[PDB]
Design a protein around this nucleic acid. Structure first.
Ligand SMILES: Nc1ncnc2c1ncn2[C@@H]1O[C@H](COP(=O)(O)OP(=O)(O)OP(=O)(O)O)[C@@H](O)[C@H]1O
Ligand SMILES: [Mg+2]
Lengths: 321, 222, 114, 97, 258
DNA sequence: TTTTTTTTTTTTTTTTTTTTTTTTTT
DNA sequence: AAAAAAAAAAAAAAAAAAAAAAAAAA
């Protein structure tokens, strides 16, 4: 509630929180149920303050920075067990967040040798270790939300989209929703946002006097006993947990009819989108429809879910809002 | 002494995915296998040559995205012309947007998600163990050729070369035909003969092989 | 610095293309070449035989080089001498004569033709 | 910065400007030099100190050194009809020192 | 906190060239600095003599013989005393804004963000020094820091004015380099229209007597020669120290010289 | 042309612990 | 026959940081 605007991105984050239904298929395959979001935008656009919120509100979350990470630090590392004496494996960031989320910041500033590993985790959702006599496959099923910056300081509308983003196409294809956000100067927007920010900066915690510095120390008292409307965060956590663990909707024909018409309309048009449209857009519509169905606490996918998914993806790809 | 994957698959298929990003160090082995199929080994004082007869199935990714109205196929991918010439067949599958095809593709994909079973159709899926049994039995078979059949191959090749001398154009085709094309024509007729036939090869077999090669060649526009 | 440089050309010729394809297919069709004599002859010529040069080679070589200079560098003459003395080692002999220098100059001028 | 063979801890080792503390460092052919190497003496020429922050070592050294440098003009020769700034490639920050 | 110092490309600022060709720092790093100071030399004689005397007093030993006295009397404090004051203030106080301070800050943010739009539209190129929400939060931080000095429990308009003035001196000055001429696409017709208007004005108005901006607009624009950028053309003519002077609250335009 | 980019190359062991099992030595 | 002293037993190695070359390009 401390971020002004960015309604569609906040809807996408909520759809991430309630993931899609994973389908296990023959030939030893699985269709991924995770939603992966990338945000590219101008400096000071509240990209990094949403990753921090996702870190806190979600059940499991792992934070990563591009330049301060390595490939052996994301997948697994070979170490030794001092107590017994064998050689073993130690988990990395990606595998520690199984059935969780990974929030990566400064994603474009990551080295190429580092960026290949994340590719495999984004594709197979498994890690292969074949070092020092330890041949193992490790499970890593995590959702990725990432934030990056364009090649130049700010986004340029007079240049083609691929020139603005330094990331390769193979990596860029593995994200369900790419959001390009831009800061445009307008007096009414400035008057509203400045008022909101100035209102936020004038908040006093209960039990504190004016001019009293915040004593974020707890005085070594760790614990006392050792074991329009908005909703409070714990209630949201309960809602997300209940939805993830109690409802598994199934697809219906009348929703498929909307999905196919949206896909066919989107594919055959001359509009210049910020990202190419391919046969993997249909899977994105299906996943977003399943997530919206979970939000409604229902066991079937309806037409309204398809409409909401279509609107979200049209905003993401086109900006037609 | 540890052999590579190329050596490991003898009389088998090597499926090289993402061949664009693979380094020149492996390009050396790929170059040498297609030439002599005998891998020379590392320099750790053993001087060993290992049999590596294998077939290659490569998947490629064009440079910076999709097909480009840049005319040269050499411009689309990084692969050298010499490396591509040794390949028996090249297939271009370009994604062209067509309103009819997208509807059937979407319906086919969504039927699998609604019901896990594949969409029932008049087409019958043959049992895979029968696939393996027939493939192995065909592999064990040994064809043979006749002098009359190969006479028409010379006429086919001279017609192809007389086309290739003028086929050099702005956009279509990759260079000119080489005797390796004649060799690959017979090599592909081998498999089409082994498929159902035996002993001498039929004349229409050469026509089928030529048709498949010509469709692959015409895939450059499509 | 290469003694002989050869250019291999491939032109679309109906006769040549047909003749090439014919014997290629004949090789694929299933129906005066020594096997190891060459290795022993090569060893014999390389390990025992050492030719010399006579004035008959002088008379031809000097005038041939001058006639080639009627842009032939001095490398050319030392290339002719080596080829002539290598031909002399063949058709087993112990001295060079007119045939060897004629073959050498013919070879080095056919190289020039390309 | 080097790893000590015995202690196996990152340690600092000397250089030309540190070997000539309270001395003179001479740099012949000062114009035929990389800019990244030339710019390393900016701190030592004026502040007479060296600061390092590498591999957990955050230290400041001392280099009380004087520099006498010799260079060649552009084209190998001096044009007396032109000002100084167009006879050399060096900029103001290094010429002022 | 980060305190950084650097030199521009070519050593000097080279006011003849564009600001984008002088600063090699990208917009990503420049948005994290609350205050940016661009430092230049003006080469004035009086300042040069004052600085020379001040520096010579340091070298000849006259510095200390003065400084102690002021440190004694009421005007300076020692390093240790100031360190202890800093730590006491930081560990004791944390001020808060007043309702009127927020109102005064919002309007200043709107003004300083509007000005950037006109500058970017005129120069038809993006600004190298950016203005964002971080620039509002920076002014809030400076206001609270100013309040912290007096151990005051509330920040008021007195501190807001000084924070605004400091921001104008630091970042708005750097953003507003005001290039006299860049010979770029922007004001391309002006490359000749400037000389045209200068000649038309110097033939109309002899070396004496004055005119008005109202008349110089109405009559010279009835002929449809207006460019909307003549506001700074008068100042550029004034820079010649002869063509134009502005008097009487800016209403009167006086011809002073050739 | 002088800038950026790129591979890549040693860097490693100096220490440990109390039993358990051996040879000398009154 | 019963004490005091003295060695074997190591093993291990990937993962990261800094510096100098030998190929790429606005
Ligand atoms: N819409 C907004 N609402 C509230 N605060 C905002 C908003 N946009 C930016 N801010 C403020 O801007 C500051 C910087 O934001 P943040 O760190 O999230 O930016 P960013 O997109 O990660 O930037 P960078 O490109 O520099 O990494 C914070 O103080 C944040 O509160
Ligand atoms: Mg950020």
């Amino acid at each position: 509630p401390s971020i002004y605007g960015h309604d569609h991105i906040k809807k996408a984050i909520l759809l991430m929180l309630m993931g899609g239904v994973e389908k296990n298929l023959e030939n030893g395959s699985h269709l991924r149920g995770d939603i992966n979001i990338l945000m590219v935008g101008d400096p000071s656009t509240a990209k990094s303050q949403l990753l921090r919120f996702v870190l806190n509100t979600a059940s499991l979350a792992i934070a990563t920075t591009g330049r301060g990470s390595s490939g052996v630090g994301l997948t697994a590392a070979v170490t030794t067990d001092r107590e017994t004496g064998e050689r073993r494996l130690e988990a990395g960031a990606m595998v520690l967040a199984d059935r969780g989320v990974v929030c990566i910041d400064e994603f474009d500033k990551m080295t190429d040798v580092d960026r290949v590993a994340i590719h495999e985790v984004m594709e197979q959702q498994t890690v292969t270790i074949a070092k020092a006599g330890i041949h193992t496959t490790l499970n890593a099923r995590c959702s990725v939300i990432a934030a990056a910056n364009p090649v130049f300081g700010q986004y340029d509308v007079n240049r083609d989209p691929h020139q603005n983003i330094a990331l390769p196409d193979s990596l860029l294809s593995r994200f369900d929703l790419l959001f390009v956000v831009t800061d445009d100067i307008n007096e009414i927007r400035d008057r509203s946002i400045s008022e909101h920010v100035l209102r936020t900066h004038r908040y006093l915690p209960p039990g504190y006097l004016e001019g009293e510095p915040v004593r974020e120390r707890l005085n070594l008292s760790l614990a006392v006993g050792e074991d329009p409307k908005l909703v409070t965060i714990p209630f949201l956590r309960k809602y997300v947990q209940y939805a993830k663990e109690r409802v598994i909707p199934q697809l219906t024909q009348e929703a498929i009819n909307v999905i196919v018409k949206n896909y066919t309309d989107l594919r055959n048009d001359d509009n210049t989108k910020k990202s190419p449209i391919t046969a993997r857009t249909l899977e994105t519509l299906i996943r977003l429809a399943t997530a919206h169905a979970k939000v409604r606490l229902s066991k079937t996918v309806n037409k309204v879910d398809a409409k909401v998914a279509a609107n979200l993806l049209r905003f993401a790809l086109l900006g037609e809002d | 002494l540890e052999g590579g994957a190329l050596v490991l698959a003898d009389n088998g298929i090597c499926c090289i995915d993402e061949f664009d990003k693979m380094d020149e160090s492996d390009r050396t082995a790929i170059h040498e296998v297609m030439e002599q199929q005998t891998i020379s080994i590392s320099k750790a004082g053993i001087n060993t040559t290992l049999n590596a007869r294998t077939s290659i199935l490569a998947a490629a990714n064009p440079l910076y995205g999709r097909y480009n109205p840049r005319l040269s196929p050499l411009d689309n991918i990084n692969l050298p012309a010499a490396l591509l010439s040794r390949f028996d067949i090249l297939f271009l599958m370009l994604d062209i947007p067509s309103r009819d095809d997208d509807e059937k593709l979407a319906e086919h994909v969504t039927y699998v998600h609604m019901h896990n079973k594949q969409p029932d159709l008049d087409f019958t899926p043959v049992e895979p163990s029968k696939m393996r049994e027939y493939i192995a039995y065909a592999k064990t078979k040994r064809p043979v050729m006749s002098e009359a059949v190969n006479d028409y191959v010379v006429q086919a090749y001279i017609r192809l070369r007389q086309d290739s001398k003028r086929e050099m154009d702005s956009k279509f085709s990759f260079g000119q035909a080489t005797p390796r094309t004649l060799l690959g024509i017979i090599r592909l007729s081998q498999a089409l003969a082994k498929l159902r036939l035996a002993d001498m090869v039929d004349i229409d077999d050469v026509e089928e092989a030529l048709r498949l090669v010509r469709v692959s060649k015409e895939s450059l526009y499509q | 610095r290469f003694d002989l440089v050869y250019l291999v050309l491939d032109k679309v010729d109906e006769k040549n293309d047909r003749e090439l394809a014919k014997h290629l297919t004949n090789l694929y069709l299933e129906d005066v070449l020594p096997v190891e004599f060459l290795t022993m002859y090569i060893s014999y010529a390389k390990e025992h035989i050492h030719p010399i040069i006579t004035e008959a080679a002088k008379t031809e070589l000097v005038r041939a080089y001058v006639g080639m200079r009627k842009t032939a560098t001095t490398r050319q003459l030392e290339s002719m001498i080596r080829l002539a003395e290598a031909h002399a080692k063949m058709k087993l002999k112990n001295v060079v004569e007119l045939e060897d220098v004629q073959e050498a100059v013919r070879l080095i001028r056919s190289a020039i033709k390309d | 910065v080097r790893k000590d063979p015995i202690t196996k801890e990152w340690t600092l080792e000397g250089g030309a400007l540190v070997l000539a503390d309270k001395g003179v460092c001479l740099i012949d052919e000062f114009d035929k030099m990389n800019d990244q190497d030339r710019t390393s003496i900016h701190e030592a020429m004026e502040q007479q100190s060296i600061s390092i922050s590498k591999a957990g070592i955050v230290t400041t050294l001392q280099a009380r050194c004087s520099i006498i440098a010799a260079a060649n003009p552009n084209g190998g020769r001096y044009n007396s009809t032109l000002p100084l700034a167009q006879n050399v490639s060096l900029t103001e920050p290094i010429l002022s020192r | 906190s980060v305190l950084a110092a650097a030199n521009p490309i070519y050593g000097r600022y080279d006011d003849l060239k564009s600001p984008g060709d002088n600063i090699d720092f990208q917009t990503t790093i420049l948005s994290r600095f609350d205050m940016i100071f661009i430092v230049k030399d003006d080469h004035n004689e009086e300042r040069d003599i004052s600085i020379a005397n001040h520096v010579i007093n340091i070298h000849t030993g006259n510095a200390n013989a003065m400084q102690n006295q002021q440190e004694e009397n009421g005007s300076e404090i020692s390093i240790e005393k100031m360190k202890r004051y800093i730590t006491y203030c930081r560990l004791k106080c944390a001020p808060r804004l007043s309702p009127q301070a927020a109102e005064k800050l919002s309007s200043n943010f709107v003004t300083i963000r509007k000005q950037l739009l006109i500058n970017e539209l005129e120069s038809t190129e993006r600004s190298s020094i950016p203005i964002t929400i971080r620039q509002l939060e920076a002014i809030i931080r400076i206001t609270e820091s100013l309040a912290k000095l007096e151990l005051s429990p509330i920040a008021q308009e007195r501190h807001v004015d000084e924070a605004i003035r400091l921001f104008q001196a630091s970042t708005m000055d750097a953003a507003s380099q005001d290039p006299i001429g860049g010979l770029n696409q922007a004001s391309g017709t002006s490359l000749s229209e400037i000389r045209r208007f200068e000649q038309e004005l110097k033939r109309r108005l002899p070396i004496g007597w004055s005119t008005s901006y109202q008349t110089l607009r109405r009559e010279f624009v009835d002929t449809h020669r207006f460019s909307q950028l003549a506001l700074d053309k008068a100042l550029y003519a004034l820079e010649k120290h002869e063509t134009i002077q502005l008097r009487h609250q800016g209403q009167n335009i006086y011809r002073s010289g050739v």
